[PDB]
Amino acid sequence: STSVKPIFSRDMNEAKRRVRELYRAWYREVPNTVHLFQLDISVKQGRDKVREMFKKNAHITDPRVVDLLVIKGKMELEETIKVWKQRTHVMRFFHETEAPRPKDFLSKFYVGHDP
């Protein structure tokens, strides 16, 4: 039952190799992206954001899911490197317009009914 067709990785050790390789490519590419897209952020800010995205999923332990996340990341790399994206797409990771939303009970209580 648990026997399942793999995507690329046969174990988490082989998958975590692809995660690290992907982080390398992203880390090289932020300096060019800031220059090419003419963004008003720093290279450190972009490299921090890459770290944040890689940290969000820091809990997964399924080799197949990690492969898909790596596949999706690599696609976003082809888009950004080849300038298929635009300045609006690259800057959507930073959520500049979204004013900070309350994250404490009292603040949520004063504004609305949401959990």
Binding site: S3, V4, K5, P6, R10, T61, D62, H113, D114, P115
Partner: protein
């Protein structure tokens, strides 16, 4: 048999990260797995044959301009259909939603006798047809 060369994964299935759903609409949403009640205004029972999954209701407010009903809940009109409770629970679990299961209410079998309407010594005798 299948000769693809397979791997063993003993982890539970969790696909939350690869579905594109914002975090707020996973952690804080409560799913309801139920068999819809029959509309008491009609006697048909074909809308009680399949399980459904719904989500908690959230705020709707009046549009200032026209008074329409405005919402910020993306999962407001999302209703899923399942053949079984097990299938529904599996789908919720792999998508990381918290769920509450309510068991099917089946009409109880009954005793129906047209003769009892004309009983000799019982209270089932009807006074009008």
């Amino acid at each position: 048999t299948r000769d693809t060369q397979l791997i063993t994964v003993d982890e539970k299935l969790d696909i939350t990260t690869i579905t594109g759903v914002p975090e707020e609409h996973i952690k804080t949403r409560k799913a309801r797995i139920f068999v819809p009640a029959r509309n008491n205004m009609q006697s048909g029972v074909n809308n009680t044959k399949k399980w459904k999954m719904e989500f908690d209701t959230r705020e709707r407010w009046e549009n200032p301009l026209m008074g329409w009903a405005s919402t910020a809940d993306p999962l407001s009109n999302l209703v899923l259909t399942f053949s079984t409770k097990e299938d529904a629970v599996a789908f919720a679990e792999k998508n990381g939603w918290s769920y509450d299961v309510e068991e099917r209410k089946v009409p109880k079998p009954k005793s129906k006798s047209y003769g009892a309407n004309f009983s000799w010594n019982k209270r089932t005798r009807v006074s009008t047809k």
